């Protein structure tokens, strides 16, 4: 009879052929940055007094 035996073999490593294609992050607008606030402004001026002739 023939006894059971192992075929001594091993697997040689190979690098898989894998690639990553294009993609978009998907965002299209930013976040609002600003508030509409009343803003004080004054032209140069000089202050007098007014009198109406009675």
């Amino acid at each position: 009879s023939v006894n059971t035996a192992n075929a001594n073999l091993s697997i040689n490593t190979s690098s898989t052929g894998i690639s990553i294609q294009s993609a978009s992050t998907g965002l299209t607008v930013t976040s609002n940055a600003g508030n509409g606030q009343a803003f004080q402004h004054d032209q140069p001026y000089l202050v007098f007094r007014v009198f109406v002739k009675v």
């Binding site: 009879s1 023939v2 006894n3 035996a5 075929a7 001594n8 073999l9 091993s10 040689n12 490593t13």
Partner: protein
């Protein structure tokens, strides 16, 4: 993947096998068979050499 393989060999499980020789003479005339005897002792006679066909 690539296989790294080396040749392998199996071990046999040879059990003893014995043939037989049926050529025992009953009459001592002619050379067809072998004359018989009473007490067996090892006189150093062996068969020939031949390969078993397996």
């Amino acid at each position: 993947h690539t296989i790294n393989q080396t040749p392998h060999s199996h071990s046999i499980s040879d059990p003893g096998h014995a043939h037989g020789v049926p050529f025992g003479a009953a009459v001592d005339n002619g050379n067809n068979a072998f004359d018989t005897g009473g007490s067996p002792y090892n006189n150093g006679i062996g068969t020939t050499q031949n390969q078993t066909g397996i």
